[PDB]
């Protein structure tokens, strides 16, 4: 079997090995039983929104041409599109939910686990508001600023301010003019599933338009999210760590973080270091906090925990046979953990009340308890570790070097060494001679429907060598540090000449001896909104929209509805924005011309839908270079 | 063509085969079109949650036999079916939070075609919410009413009080104590699709209970749209008309209010009176106002207007080539009326921005403007009876007589002439002495699937012999009035003995020389919230929770996803809720179970999927008569 076909990496290659050996079924092996898939649901051409469906259309050919009820291919497609945008806004915002009510547990003396740990980021973010802080006691302010976050969930006397605050008032009267701006999330999610219901609306277009509002309602969730977290947890600053199955040591108590909210997580890394002993006199050598997807991004960015794998490959650390406990929140998290622990011994934890797996050990983590629930969890995991003591292990000795921690504070005081009073200017400057040809940002999942990191690393070499600055989020971030994108030793073999003298200078002007790293790592899935602070820093310093700047984005192995979300929120926002998987719209032609063409004049981005990665890499220079060429620049 | 296979009203049987002559496709075309529907989507086992589907699993036999993700038939089937319960709720409640946004606006001047028209009923509301009202303005308690309204969408120091305010408290303390109670009606409603989306909630009980605590912020949002249109557009009280396609009017404008949120179509019915000059100058005779679907029922119950069709045989309505306009808000619409108004000559109009249909004509109704738009609306129609004058037009010269308009106040107050200071206790004694077996609401939609109204007809059939008191709402109502369940002179043939006594007096007390009908319509579906505040009454009265009460539900041609969730919140308050139709739950055995058996150690209630309604009319006599042998009665 040529598991390389499967993944790219190879120690997960090896892994795919070592599961077939011992027949255990793998996300690979249930995506081959699986095919070949309903075309109707590929193509977008099913409805299953009333009883008296199931609706399907035929792409081409014969009856059935429409839905019982009348509803067109277009309104279909819409509709189908449109939930998945409520359903990724849904899961952001939740999170971002369940921060702001640990954040004012906090302050108010009800979980003493949690404290502002970033009391500049509480006061820049009270100041964006618009919240007074001269005089204020910070608990204070960070009880007002967790209760404006809780009242963006409904309708009120402003909008979303985790939209209209953070965009450029050129860019939210764009939105304005065009009924686009949101609300209150939640009220946009709930507006989504009833517009979307059956006998409800039934026109391509103004459904598209409701998709874009509830997509700036996730911009909204995600934003909210990476603020709440910093203040709670600090702001990411440039961490080394690193990252692939090599992490794990089969000497340890290895305890894996998995999901996304790190609510409980971050204080799991805390927590592990008090047990150390008890770890040892269990026999370990110590408890090793290890990462997997973005749970597992949040306390790489913030403690420099490694990060052992990340999305479609997921089930992997457990067949090495050393993972001792799974620590689950919610998202991203393929249920089969919990059947394939049987096999290899792990203790697979569910704390979330809404987020359960039948089969899973739960424990009903609660901020009040959190340090206590801790403690419980890292003693299952102990114990679990007692259970293997004697046991072998398959490790694959493979990992990579990670620079990381670049959030958007990190990048202007990084470029601030090189331009103290104007730190945009110098990464402006590059832009405009021609060193730094434009911004990508690479978001999202790996997807099974395609070769593990193979668009991610395809279509990031392609643009290092033409001098893109690439920034990464998620598990493209994770694509990218798994194959060495995140460690400086490889910037000489990747980067083009403009984009090598830069990465150097910012970073031996950091004191670093070398060059920042070529790919930087900006965060989480949330953290997405990270790269939104910097591209509207960007086109205020500049003076334009961001449908103006060299700036795109690329959700290049895109799965979960919240990179659906994301990337209908990237194009909203003003840019050029690439899927790589096929999403279910081309059995309509009229969604698929909105999506990828006439939006461009309604917001200025637009979708480019494009599986083969070559070709994706030159689309996405294309519209760079559009763009270097819209503002009078060489290209 | 055998009509009727398709719908046993005879009215539509005549329209069916005009448009087979003219070549205009229908919904039971499109459904013949469509057969042999998949059967993954029948079943259930299909999800398209994420771009690595669609992922499908066999009912029986080999693979594929999971989700790509390691999702279980039972997780699959359980998220489904919770995405059709929140997307139920989004309509109720956004129906609810658009009259709650126009009582504001009234009472704050913003829309003075609006008011306080019911007075009674909102100090009823405010004292049952705990808002003072001794020595306050009118405006202002409503103002206090609408904000609390509103307060119930989102997370705040109490829950949901449009549930916990509504139900027995005995009630309530069963909910709570399985954490059923909702947090906040769209709170809900995101939960839910965040817990659904890839990778979250993977355990079939968890997931439930998820949907079970959403249909109850639907019930909050049904309850609160019942309320919010009785204070503003009065409560219904008994009226007489007449029902199906004959209340067309060939020498009239025949203008269709269709949808459910009669915010506007209340306006239309008065602005209509003052057009009739108007009308007739363009040489109608008049202004002929009628229903379609809830929206229709809305204007029956609350000023007599006779009710042309429902639900599947709405098109059938234009076929007769007299309808010059329908006027369309939201749900339950099919889109398909926009194409067949081309045919037919009728003006297809929208009113609402999250509803639109391509090809018809939209009216951006405000109502700050309100009898402004209802003008230009009307005049549209008149101007489209002038395009028909000397046209022929085939009116099917059929339609029934309907009483209606028993709101619960209306019951109570019908009641209290035979027992003045305890309006409740004549009901309850004569369901103690047999005369009233128990009490069975008919609720929902028609669906293409079952040969309209059969399931309607034949089940209220059985149980009217059986001395069960019959109650309807929605276009279940349609269904028994359009077959003549509403007129009292059919209450000697279909009527047992011991009902035909109950109804008799309490007709003849009423001043009607004559019984009641031999059903109640107690309105549009949101008003299902009025069977449950009579039940709730009955309960309290009795000492007991609702679980003990011989009180039944039917949704026996269901289609809608709101029609999901009513029938869920049945369950979930305590009764036994027939559905006629399959749901989407057959392809998870362990689901099905929890639905129709292991929920009862949970709520008392639970589902009866039965789609022959002789059988079902047997099983809901079967739980009615459980549920006396429980209080000890004969039976
Ligand atoms: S909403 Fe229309 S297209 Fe969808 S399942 Fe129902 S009848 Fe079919
Ligand atoms: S990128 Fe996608 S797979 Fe990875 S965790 Fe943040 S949503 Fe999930
Ligand atoms: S969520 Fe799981 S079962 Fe559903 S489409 Fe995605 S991989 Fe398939
Ligand atoms: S019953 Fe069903 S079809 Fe009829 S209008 Fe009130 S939801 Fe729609
Ligand atoms: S017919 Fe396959 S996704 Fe519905
Ligand atoms: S395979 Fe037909 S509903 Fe998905």
């Keep these: 079997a040529r598991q390389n076909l499967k993944s790219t990496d190879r120690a997960v290659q090896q892994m795919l090995d070592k599961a077939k050996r011992e027949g255990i079924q793998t996300v690979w092996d249930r995506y081959e039983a699986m095919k070949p898939q309903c075309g109707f649901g590929e193509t977008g051409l099913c409805c299953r929104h009333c009883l008296q469906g199931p609706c399907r259309i035929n792409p081409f050919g014969d009856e059935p041409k429409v839905g019982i009820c009348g509803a067109t291919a277009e309104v279909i497609v819409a509709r189908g599109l449109d939930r998945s945008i409520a359903a990724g806004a849904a899961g952001h915002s939740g999170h971002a939910k369940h921060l702001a009510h640990t954040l004012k547990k906090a302050v108010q003396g009800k979980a003493a686990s949690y404290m ?184 790489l960015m913030r403690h420099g925990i490694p990060a052992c794998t990340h999305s ?43 987020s359960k797996i039948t089969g899973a050990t739960h424990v009903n983590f609660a901020e009040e308890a959190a340090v206590e629930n801790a403690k419980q969890i890292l003693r299952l995991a102990i114990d679990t570790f007692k259970r293997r003591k004697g046991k072998p292990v398959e490790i694959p000795n493979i990992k990579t070097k990670v620079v990381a921690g670049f959030s958007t504070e990190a990048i202007i005081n990084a470029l601030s060494k090189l331009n103290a009073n104007d730190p945009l ?59 060495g994108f995140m ?41 997405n909104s990270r790269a939104v602070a910097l591209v509207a820093a960007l086109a205020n310093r500049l003076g334009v929209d961001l449908d103006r700047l060299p700036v795109v984005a690329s959700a290049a192995e895109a799965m979960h509805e919240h990179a659906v979300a994301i990337g209908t929120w990237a194009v909203t926002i003003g840019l050029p924005t690439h899927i790589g998987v096929l999403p279910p719209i081309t059995g309509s032609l009229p969604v698929t011309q909105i999506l990828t063409s006439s939006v461009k004049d309604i917001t200025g981005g637009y979708f480019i839908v494009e599986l083969d990665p070559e070709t994706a890499a030159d689309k996405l220079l294309a519209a760079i270079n559009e763009r270097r060429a819209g503002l009078g620049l060489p290209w």
């Design 116 to 299: 502002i740990k970033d009391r500049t980021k509480l006061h820049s973010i009270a100041k964006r508001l618009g919240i007074p802080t001269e005089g204020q006691k910070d608990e204070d302010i960070a009880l007002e600023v967790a209760k404006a976050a809780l009242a963006d969930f409904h309708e009120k006397d402003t909008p979303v301010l985790w939209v209209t605050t953070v965009l450029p008032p050129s860019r939210v009267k764009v939105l304005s003019a065009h009924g686009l701006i949101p609300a209150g999330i939640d009220h946009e999610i709930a507006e989504i599933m009833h517009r979307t219901s059956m006998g409800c609306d039934a026109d391509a277009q103004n459904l598209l338009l409701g998709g874009l509002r509830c997509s700036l309602a996730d911009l909204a969730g995600c934003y909210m999210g990476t603020d709440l977290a910093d203040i709670l947890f600090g702001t990411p600053a440039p961490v080394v760590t690193e990252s692939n199955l090599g992490v794990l040591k089969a000497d340890a108590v290895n305890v894996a973080v998995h999901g996304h909210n790190p609510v409980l997580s971050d204080i799991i890394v805390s927590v592990s270091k008090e047990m150390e002993n008890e770890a040892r006199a269990a026999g370990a050598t110590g408890i090793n906090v290890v990462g997997i997807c973005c749970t597992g991004n949040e306390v």
């Design 312 to 354: 479609v490959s997921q089930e992997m650390a457990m067949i090495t046979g050393a993972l001792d406990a799974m620590i689950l929140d919610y998202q991203c998290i393929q249920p089969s953990v919990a059947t394939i622990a049987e096999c290899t011994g792990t203790t697979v934890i569910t704390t979330m009340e809404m």
């Design 425 to 483: 200017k110098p990464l402006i400057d590059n832009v405009v001679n021609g060193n730094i040809r434009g911004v990508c940002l690479f978001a999202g999942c790996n997807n099974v429907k395609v070769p593990q990191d193979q668009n991610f690393t395809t279509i990031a070499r392609k643009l290092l060598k033409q001098n893109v600055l690439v920034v990464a989020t998620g598990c493209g971030a994770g694509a990218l540090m798994r194959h």
């Design 487 to 527: 460690d400086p030793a490889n910037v000489d073999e990747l980067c083009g000449d403009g984009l090598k003298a830069v990465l150097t200078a910012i970073g031996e002007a950091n004191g670093l001896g070398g060059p920042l790293p070529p790919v930087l790592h900006m965060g989480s899935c949330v953290d």
